[PDB]
Design a binder for this molecule. Sequence first.
Ligand code: D10
Ligand code: CA
Ligand code: CA
Ligand code: CA
Ligand code: TL
Ligand code: TL
Ligand code: TL
Ligand code: TL
Ligand code: TL
Ligand code: TL
Ligand code: TL
Lengths: 211, 210, 211, 211, 253, 243
Amino acid sequence: EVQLQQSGPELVKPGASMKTSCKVSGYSFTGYIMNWVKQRHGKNLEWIGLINPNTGYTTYNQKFKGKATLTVDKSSSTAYMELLSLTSEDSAIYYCTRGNYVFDYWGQGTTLTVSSAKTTPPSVYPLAPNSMVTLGCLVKGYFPEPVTVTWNSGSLSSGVHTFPAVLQSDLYTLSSSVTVPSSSWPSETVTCNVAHPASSTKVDKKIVPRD
Amino acid sequence: EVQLQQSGPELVKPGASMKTSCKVSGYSFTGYIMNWVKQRHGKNLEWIGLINPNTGYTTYNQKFKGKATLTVDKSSSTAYMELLSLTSEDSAIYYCTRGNYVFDYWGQGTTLTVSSAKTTPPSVYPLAPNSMVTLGCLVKGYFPEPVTVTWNSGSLSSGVHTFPAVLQSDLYTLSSSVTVPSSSWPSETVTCNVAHPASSTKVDKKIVPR
Amino acid sequence: QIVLTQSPAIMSASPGEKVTMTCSASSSVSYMHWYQQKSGTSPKRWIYDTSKLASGVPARFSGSGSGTSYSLTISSMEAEDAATYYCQQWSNSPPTFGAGAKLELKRADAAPTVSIFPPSSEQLTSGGASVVCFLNNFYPKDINVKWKIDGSERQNGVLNSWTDQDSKDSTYSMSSTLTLTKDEYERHNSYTCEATHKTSTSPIVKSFNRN
Amino acid sequence: QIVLTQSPAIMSASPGEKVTMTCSASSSVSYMHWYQQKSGTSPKRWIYDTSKLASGVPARFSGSGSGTSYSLTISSMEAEDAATYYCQQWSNSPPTFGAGAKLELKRADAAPTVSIFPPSSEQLTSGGASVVCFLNNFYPKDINVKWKIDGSERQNGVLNSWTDQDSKDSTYSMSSTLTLTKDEYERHNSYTCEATHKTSTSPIVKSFNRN
Amino acid sequence: RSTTLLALLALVLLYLVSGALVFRALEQPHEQQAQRELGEVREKFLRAHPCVSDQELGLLIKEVADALGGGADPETSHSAWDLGSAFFFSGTIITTIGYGNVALRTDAGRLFCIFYALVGIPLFGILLAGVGDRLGSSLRHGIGHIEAIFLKWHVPPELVRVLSAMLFLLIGCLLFVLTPTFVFCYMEDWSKLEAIYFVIVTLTTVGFGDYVAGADPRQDSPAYQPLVWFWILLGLAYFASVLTTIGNWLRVV
Amino acid sequence: RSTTLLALLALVLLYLVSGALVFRALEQPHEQQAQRELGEVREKFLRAHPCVSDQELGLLIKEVADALGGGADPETQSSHSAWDLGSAFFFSGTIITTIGYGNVALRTDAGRLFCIFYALVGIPLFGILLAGVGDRLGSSLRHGIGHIEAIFLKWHVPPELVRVLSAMLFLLIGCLLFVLTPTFVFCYMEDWSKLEAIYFVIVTLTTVGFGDYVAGADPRQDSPAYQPLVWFWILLGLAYFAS
Ligand SMILES: CCCCCCCCCC
Ligand SMILES: [Ca+2]
Ligand SMILES: [Ca+2]
Ligand SMILES: [Ca+2]
Ligand SMILES: [Tl+]
Ligand SMILES: [Tl+]
Ligand SMILES: [Tl+]
Ligand SMILES: [Tl+]
Ligand SMILES: [Tl+]
Ligand SMILES: [Tl+]
Ligand SMILES: [Tl+]
């Protein structure tokens, strides 16, 4: 079982650089070419460059010439990528993948986030207004991802959509909907529970009908 | 720790063929070229040929063209050599070794013996005739190698040479010497212990003075 | 340098349907490779050297092509086939990818369940005012939202978010969020969220009055 | 079919002595490699690419050369250095080896301790008669044995065997075995084994009478 | 006549343009075959050798090309400036054939080559005229014996002269065109068409160099390499005599 | 004269052997070096790529060499055409002139077959035109010389020497126009050295046509009128070298 194990997510300031790793097992590291690939949120895949772990030889995409430095550590069969002078356009998922003509094995990827933002807890605002009724939670102005939204401590889990976060002037916003039978609300309380691990923030918000 | 583990010694009739193996561990089998080398009793090393385990490609020494076939089993990272229509000229040690310019890792070797002989237990004959005395054991007419010789069940280990076997009309002969203080013999008994594993033969011989 | 075009970028198939996606190259290549990617995870070598199947891949998949035109085909769509497929080439360095072709599951059309939500009192006290609209569990994904303030249309300060296709009901959902300052909010009275979907010629509209 | 000549094929060194063995090539060669072999075991890469030391190898070993003439050198002989060294080349397929250079330890000369042995009674009863002579723990290795029956020399049905240099005293030893039929044995009475070694101008002779 | 020579220019011009059209029609579709093959070789190698990047293989191929361009030969004896090959090369100059399958790499080589040719070619032309007259003499003399038969058969002396010219070239053709082509077929493992192509490209002194016979000697057939030189010499003189007289016929026309 | 023919043969023979000695002295060392460099490249590659046998690398190099020998270019992986109308025109010229640079090979049997008949008919046809232009070019030169010759004769230089001086001028100006002028042209146009340019010029006008140097062949040049126009020179230069 071949396996490329990439290091965890990283969050860095604009201008700073960053180094990330890809440890191989299940085959001999030096026998195959290592590449790196960039995928900026769910779009086209970009080949960054390659290194021959056995020879140290590197080539790069012209796009990334000054940006990226590939190295390896033969003894720990580990490949490294360093990214330099990071700008916001560098925020993406980066894969290490193996191959010299097709890319036959890929790491699980690592997410890089480049941002000036400071850790900020979210404001959580309830969204209150047919048999069914829909209620919501607005979670805005937090950094960084992720937040977790549950409903009634997770006992209310069907009928739920949480939408993707979006960037608004350097901070994240999303909302979550939940749909319930109107006999249940407001006969029964509904509270959305929001956690933001980065700020050690746990917040509960009861949805109350507009007065 | 790279390692090439060859299969054991093989004994075959003239005319027969034979296949021997070399399993690698400590690196990736398919990443490196495998070679085989012949060494006929303690003399020049002869490159037989090579195979690329990844591509199946083989080239051979012209000397060995029709003689030898190299193959691999990728899954068990094992290399094979087959030798054909064997004659006594083929009796030798054969190594598998790794490399595409220098041979950096070698198997421990395998000995091939080509012979018509049948398993025969040895006759063991004592050799009896100053401060030191030398006594001996003649071990003759056995096949195949090896035998092992000890003295007084290993209580006598210094002063001992066992000489190389030699072929005498298709069977092996050797002897073993041991040197002891003449105060010890025949005041004390000396017996040589001979084992021939191939025939399940274990024999003790007391050296008695003429 | 060589450019790969996969068009259309989105397509959809019922299960049992035959599916064909194409990859056209800016200039000829000798081989084409394809990867399959599902949200959340790295790409997988799917087909390589034009028509060879990778280990895991079921037989319903096939590849073909030559020179400048290559294709990936599914003889009979299945559910687990929903994914994004990318082509790539390495007959010329640097290697390059198609922009990918997303393949969604087809299903019966569904109208959006629409809900509009006024700013919470909590938010208003901090000087902001976000008006939120959920358009839930509809198909297909093509949909348009329009905001109206006192009958007058507003497009600025609006942010949208779509979910991925739901894995159980195959629907889509989206949120639209009009973010205003409390000032702008309190100047007007009627707020309307207006949805145009294939399922009706006449928009679906939810509204509310500030009082 | 480049030919490598190591000459002399045998040499001997006292401990502390500098040792140099040479390898000349039938035509020019860009690198030379060397193996060390001790009887009983496979060769070990010792020096490769002319002057690079393999991992195990102590510093007293060095290599050099170029074109058609290469050499392996030991700055100061040690005991464990006794071995056969082979050169080999792969600047042209097929690779080839020197015929090897055997390096024995020098030591003070030693006369053979000689012993002759009459046929055992056990052997005689079966109709065979082997007369054995041990020449033990002498140096150097050059030695000659002569058999005499009733004072007249016999050189048929004699078989010889030498040991390798002894690992602890650096001596050599050999057996000589006159094998006769019981017939031939009982016809004569005096049996003598005669050893010529450089340590004395006068042979060493052990004899026995059948009586 | 200046008027007529202008006409002749225009004719030739049309002969060229017509040639151009045909060669382009026949060859343009395969301009790229060698590239395609090189690329196939690369891609095939990469698939067989995972320890090699495309880009690394690229450098290898550049470095190989440079060495080949310096006159290296792929080895698996082959010196193009050993005495025998240099002799041959010098032959290719004074004959003006100029196969050029081996190029001069040094400025001295080039410089020397200039003077070597200026002096060598006319010197050779003289010998060639000489051998042309002597070879034609031998041929015409032998044909004269057969001419005796025609004259007795009361065939007009004018036609007998014609039949002898036909014979003159036909026998030469046989000895210097047909015979060699069959020879090279077997010796060089060329096709008949390749062999005739070579022969004629050679005897016309065009000397493309896509095909070359006698640059190196062949073990197991010693007489080969000299006989080829001997052949070029004799063949050129035979071809020359044909051109001078067909040139001779043409200019009066 | 049979005696002289044999002497001449022996002389030529010596001219060849002497040539051989010189070229070997001047070229072999460079060649032996290249051969070495190829081998260094192999051995270097093997040391860097254990997955490759020497023998396998050998086949690669042979196969690469064959393709390069067929005119593949190491630099790219695959716009300009060597058989466009202008280059094909040029190629045809190289045949009938017997120059035969050969820097672009015919790949098809039809190409070869046609080329045979094209030459057999083309070369003598060209020879005729060449004789014609040779006489006409010499005529025009000789006429132009006549006017300057009038000046020498008035200066009371003997009519025998005036004929000699005029020949000097005759060739010197031709040389100037057909040797020197072109070499200076090509120097600047092809980025060759002076020595390379003269080498080319002369290899060309002698109809040796090695093909190591060819004017206009360069792929990058945007020079349509260039290559045929050079043929204009080739025509005039050949007829004048015939003398
Ligand atoms: C051999 C065919 C060409 C004519 C001989 C060379 C004369 C051209 C001027 C040197
Ligand atoms: Ca076996
Ligand atoms: Ca060469
Ligand atoms: Ca040669
Ligand atoms: Tl043939
Ligand atoms: Tl010519
Ligand atoms: Tl030519
Ligand atoms: Tl030529
Ligand atoms: Tl040429
Ligand atoms: Tl060429
Ligand atoms: Tl220049």
